[PDB]
Amino acid sequence: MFTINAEVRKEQGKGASRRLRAANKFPAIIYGGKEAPLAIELDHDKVMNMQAKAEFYSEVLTIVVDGKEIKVKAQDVQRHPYKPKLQHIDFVRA
Amino acid sequence: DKKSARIRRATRARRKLQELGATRLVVHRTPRHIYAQVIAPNGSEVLVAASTVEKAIAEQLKYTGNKDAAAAVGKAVAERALEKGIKDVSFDRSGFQYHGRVQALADAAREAGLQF
Amino acid sequence: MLQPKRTKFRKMHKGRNRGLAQGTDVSFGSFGLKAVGRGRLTARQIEAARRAMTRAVKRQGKIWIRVFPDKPITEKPLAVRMGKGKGNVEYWVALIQPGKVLYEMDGVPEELAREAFKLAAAKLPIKTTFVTKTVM
Amino acid sequence: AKTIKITQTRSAIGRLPKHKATLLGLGLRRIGHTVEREDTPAIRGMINAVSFMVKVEE
Amino acid sequence: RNGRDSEAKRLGVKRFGGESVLAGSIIVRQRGTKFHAGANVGCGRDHTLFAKADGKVKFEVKGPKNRKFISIEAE
RNA sequence: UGCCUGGCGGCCGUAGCGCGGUGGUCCCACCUGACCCCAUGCCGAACUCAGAAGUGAAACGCCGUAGCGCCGAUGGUAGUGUGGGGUCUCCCCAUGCGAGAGUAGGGAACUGCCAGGCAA
RNA sequence: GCUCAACGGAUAAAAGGUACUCCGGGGAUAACAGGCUGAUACCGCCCAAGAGUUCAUAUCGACGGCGGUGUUUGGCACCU
RNA sequence: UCCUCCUAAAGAGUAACGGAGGAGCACGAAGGUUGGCUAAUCCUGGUCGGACAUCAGGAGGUUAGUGCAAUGGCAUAAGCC
RNA sequence: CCGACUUACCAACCCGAUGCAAACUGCGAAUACCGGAGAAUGUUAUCACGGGAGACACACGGCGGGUGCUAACGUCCGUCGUGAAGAGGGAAACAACCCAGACCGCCAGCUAAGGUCCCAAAGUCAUGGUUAAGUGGGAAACGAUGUGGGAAGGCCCAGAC
Ligand SMILES: [Mg+2]
Ligand SMILES: [Mg+2]
Ligand SMILES: [Mg+2]
Ligand SMILES: [Mg+2]
Ligand SMILES: [Mg+2]
Ligand SMILES: [Mg+2]
Ligand SMILES: [Mg+2]
Ligand SMILES: [Mg+2]
Ligand SMILES: [Mg+2]
Ligand SMILES: [Mg+2]
Ligand SMILES: [Mg+2]
Ligand SMILES: [Mg+2]
Ligand SMILES: [Mg+2]
Ligand SMILES: [Mg+2]
Ligand SMILES: [Mg+2]
Ligand SMILES: [Mg+2]
Ligand SMILES: [Mg+2]
Ligand SMILES: [Mg+2]
Ligand SMILES: [Mg+2]
Ligand SMILES: [Mg+2]
Ligand SMILES: [Mg+2]
Ligand SMILES: [Mg+2]
Ligand SMILES: [Mg+2]
Ligand SMILES: [Mg+2]
Ligand SMILES: [Mg+2]
Ligand SMILES: [Mg+2]
Ligand SMILES: [Mg+2]
Ligand SMILES: [Mg+2]
Ligand SMILES: [Mg+2]
Ligand SMILES: [Mg+2]
Ligand SMILES: [Mg+2]
Ligand SMILES: [Mg+2]
Ligand SMILES: [Mg+2]
Ligand SMILES: [Mg+2]
Ligand SMILES: [Mg+2]
Ligand SMILES: [Mg+2]
Ligand SMILES: [Mg+2]
Ligand SMILES: [Mg+2]
Ligand SMILES: [Mg+2]
Ligand SMILES: [Mg+2]
Ligand SMILES: [Mg+2]
Ligand SMILES: [Mg+2]
Ligand SMILES: [Mg+2]
Ligand SMILES: [Mg+2]
Ligand SMILES: [Mg+2]
């Protein structure tokens, strides 16, 4: 049931990335395979709960972005240095 | 190694020669077949090249691995280089001690008209 | 007290403490005491926060010290006018940035380690927090 | 070619030397001094340099 | 005990890339051999690279050791 | 025109090592011998000369393998020019610039002038 | 031919006392007092091993931490 | 007084009784050129011989050396004969 | 003597993992600076030569640092602004802070910073929340069913606290 809701970003970079991270929405990206790396934007509260379970980093996930399902594996994650939250996650399209 | 030790001995005279912008006569020696060729200042292409490996030279020799064979090369290069108009060249030993076949190649080239 | 055995130079600059730390993840043990507030820990404080940490979780367990001073701090004697040179090195501090795991513990219950890091946090100046080793 | 309008909205007193020099390069003298310059990336870079004190209108 | 220092030697790269120089003009005033003598550029006893011809400076990165070189295209 | 080999380069680790296989018609290296040219601060090791029975072990070249070296995005983060703000020994906001490391992956080079051998 | 090394070298050649002192200046610069600061000083608080027959907090308080005051010793020379 | 590094904020310069160290020479060769050569340290073996003399090979790779302090540089060697 | 095994211990070098550096660099910005080209703009703002000088006690604020105690309206530099040599409005008053550069006059208007209940010119304005402390209107570690918002989870009239 590891199905995360995501979106498609339209803005990026230091200014545009922190701007939405201040709204419970931390960015991410889906790369790997043959496609172009997709700028995935997703909610924080839901994902913050999913990563509590250790199966999150082992089981193949499912990202429903704009209807299109993408099955991935959480590759790299950036936690906030001292606060219990996230900043960005690398999803290898597996 | 015997081969790589020779290349570092050549580097001194190779690098000094291209800044000057000279047309060097690169002579390669081997226990058999003493080679020789004239290379343009651009360091890329040769203009005149003659050695004993050519059938035009080997068929007029007793053995392509000695002085009289080396004297046959220098004359051939210096006579076909005086055909292309390359007169004033430089002599690059290629790390070889200027004493035997490398000396005989120059002596045959100096008398022909190849200026160096 | 943790002190460097013969560094290259005796005295060194003050230096600013800007930025965020790097040793952020719990690596050796499973529980940590991440430093939230920026500051500087002397060799006395690190040593004091260890005794009253290696007392709560008895002879059992293993404690890692992810910090090491390696920064000499000068102190001029009393009644000495300014100038005349750099003072004398008295103690060694460790520049602590936010997100720097100070200690790591392993071989004990989580609730025990939760209470052990409460005894050590009261011996350190910087505000700390309790973090858990995460799966990647 | 078409032109653009630039109007200074703030003073140039407590500004860096390269900020007073830009207003000299645009022609702006005092606040409210309206000026008209050509619309080129040479000028567009000048408006973008002192954008905190100029109010451009296309 | 301290309180001693030298007089700054004013080192560094005088003429930069694309800058038209004259014969004899100093391109680089250096200590060791950070930059090397490329084409139409000599090297003094002070390891000072000067321009042996009119033209423009052209920094390069030739060689099997990626060492810096300075050439001169006659311009 | 193609596979081979040697020389002089361009570019210079995507181009270098490790392991394995492999080449001798030519070429290359090893190799045989040394009155003589020349030679070792002893010695034909090297340098040099006169030649060439034998060999492809060594050396070098080539093909495979990624066990390493190495190269390396997108995204994010660190930093930061300018203008503002704050709980102003440190940060934040607006705009512009944007690393290093790490990850997907790439990867055991590419190419030019000449001169020979070779199937044609 | 010069440690003319006070090394752009005042003479070739030169040390001290002044509470018997004097003149011209300076709060450009000290002593006393004020101001800024608060290392030290004094006071309080925090964690708490341990002491107290038993028992951390009746009473003390190790190892360390955080502030206040502007009485000490000082720092600074802003005022005279 | 002069030289090297930092301070010094990626051109140059940049202060303090700030932090670290040297010089007041040496050489007729340690200079010029030509030819050639390239290390330190370990490992294995070996008469006296030993942690460390000389010798042989391997590993390693410029961690060596550079008349002298430091920094930059160096095998195309500026290092060695 | 040779010399094997063993040890409540410490540990060289390599290997994997983890931090630190003004005097460390297999990497590496932003700016700044040097040169070329191009347009607009500026009373040539540029350089050289000559006449006259003054000045060589600087101060504070920002940023980047040395020193001190990341103390000082401290001390010393880099760079910028301001004062110095600049009034005016605001910061209660307050050279150096924010805004802004006074040729003169006017019982005219629009705005900057900052403000709009009265002292004292302008909102006792509008919508939606927060705070019980006179917080706002001096301050820390630490302490507390103070109280508001958000997400998640445990148990629950097969009866929980
Ligand atoms: Mg920003
Ligand atoms: Mg301002
Ligand atoms: Mg000095
Ligand atoms: Mg210096
Ligand atoms: Mg073989
Ligand atoms: Mg990026
Ligand atoms: Mg500060
Ligand atoms: Mg990168
Ligand atoms: Mg004198
Ligand atoms: Mg003097
Ligand atoms: Mg008298
Ligand atoms: Mg008097
Ligand atoms: Mg006093
Ligand atoms: Mg007791
Ligand atoms: Mg008092
Ligand atoms: Mg006092
Ligand atoms: Mg005074
Ligand atoms: Mg003063
Ligand atoms: Mg007074
Ligand atoms: Mg002087
Ligand atoms: Mg500089
Ligand atoms: Mg010498
Ligand atoms: Mg030589
Ligand atoms: Mg032995
Ligand atoms: Mg031995
Ligand atoms: Mg020499
Ligand atoms: Mg790397
Ligand atoms: Mg600079
Ligand atoms: Mg320019
Ligand atoms: Mg121009
Ligand atoms: Mg003076
Ligand atoms: Mg002065
Ligand atoms: Mg400062
Ligand atoms: Mg001051
Ligand atoms: Mg000053
Ligand atoms: Mg004023
Ligand atoms: Mg005023
Ligand atoms: Mg006030
Ligand atoms: Mg007033
Ligand atoms: Mg005016
Ligand atoms: Mg109005
Ligand atoms: Mg307003
Ligand atoms: Mg009113
Ligand atoms: Mg109202
Ligand atoms: Mg109050």
Give residue for tokens 């507030």. C37
CB C121 within 8 A of CB C33: yes
Which helix (H) or strand (E) element contains residue D26?
helix D17-26
The tokens for C84 are 């005349």
**Six-digit token pair at C83?**
């100038």
Give the DSSP per-residue string, E6-70: ------EESS-TT-EE-TT-EEEE-SS-SEEE-SSB---TT--EEBSSSEEEEEE--STT--EEE
C-alpha span between A50 and A68 (Å, rounded): 21
Helix (H, G, I), strand (E, B), or coil: what is residue D34? strand
Could you tell me the CATH number of the domain that includes residue B38?
3.30.420.100
**Cα–Cα dist B6/B19, whole Å:** 21
Q: How far apart are the C-alpha atoms of B60 and B4, rounded to whole Å? A: 33
The DSSP bridge pattern shows strands C88-96 and C39-42 to be antiparallel
Tokens standing for residue D37:
């310059």
Instruction: Find where tokens 């300075």 sit.
Output: E70
Up-side HSE of residue E30: CA atoms within 13 Å toward CB? 17
Q: Which nucleotides of H are covered by protein (CB under 7 A)?
A: 2-8, 11-22, 35-38, 71-78
Q: Are A46 and A4 in contact (CB under 8 A)?
A: yes
Specify the resolution in Å: 3.2
**DSSP helix/strand/coil, B17:** helix
Let me know if residue C1 belongs to a domain: no
Q: Given an 8 Å threshold on Cβ–Cβ distance, is C24 in contact with A79?
A: yes
Count Cβ atoms within 10 A of the Cβ of residue C128 and give its class: 0-12 exposed, 13-18 middle, 19 or more buried. Answer: buried
User: How many folded domains does chain E comprise?
Assistant: 1
Distance of CA B59 to the CA centre of its chain: 20
Q: Which residues 6-45 of chain B have a CB under 7 Å from nucleic chain H?
A: 8-9, 11-13, 15-16
With an 8 Å Cβ cutoff, are A82 and C98 in contact? yes
Cβ < 7 Å from strand I, D residues 13-52: 13-18, 24-27, 30-31, 37-38, 40, 42-43
Closest to E53 (Cα-Cα) out of E37, E36, E73: E73
Could you say which nucleotides of strand I lie within 7 A of any protein CB atom? 17-24, 32, 34-36, 38-42, 64-72, 74-75, 80-82, 98-101, 112, 141-142, 150-152
Residue type, B98: Y
Which ligand is closest in space to the CA of residue E4? 3
What is the dihedral angle through the alpha carbons of B42, B44, B50, B55, rounded to the nearest 10 degrees? Answer: -160
Q: Which domain holds residue E34?
A: 11-75
What CATH number corresponds to the domain at position D40? 3.30.1390.20
Beta strand residue intervals within chain C, DSSP E:
31-35, 39-42, 62-65, 72-75, 88-96, 100-106, 128-132
Interatomic separation, CA of residue D40 and C1' of nucleotide I155, rounded (Å): 71
Domain residues of chain A, as ranges? 1-94
DSSP H helices, B1-116, are: 2-20, 55-58, 67-80, 101-112
* Dist CA E55 CA E38 (whole Å): 14
CA dihedral D38, D42, D44, D46 (to 10 degrees): -110
Chain C CB contacts of A57 below 8 Å: 135-136
Whose tokens are 């000695």? That residue is B66
For residue E70, the cross-strand partners are E37, E59
User: Minimal Cα–Cα distance from C57 to chain A, Å?
Assistant: 25
Provide the number of structural domains found in chain D. Answer: 1
β-partners of residue C92 are C72
Contact A82 C136 (CB under 8 A): no
Which residue range(s) make up the domain with C72? 21-136
CA E25 distance to own-chain centroid: 10
Domain count, chain C: 1
How far apart, in whole angstroms, are the C-alpha atoms of residue E49 and residue E52?
9
Distance CA B58, CA B69 (A): 8
Number of H helices, E strands in chain B: 4, 4
Rounded to whole angstroms, the Cα distance separating E23 from E40 reads: 10
* Boundaries of domain holding D13: 1-58
CATH superfamily of A1-94: Ribosomal Protein L25; Chain P (2.40.240.10)
**E48 touches E28 (CB < 8 A):** yes
- The CATH code of the domain that includes C118 is 3.90.1170.10
Task: Give the CA angle between residues C10, C11, C15 to the nearest 5°.
Answer: 140
The amino acid occupying position C4 is P
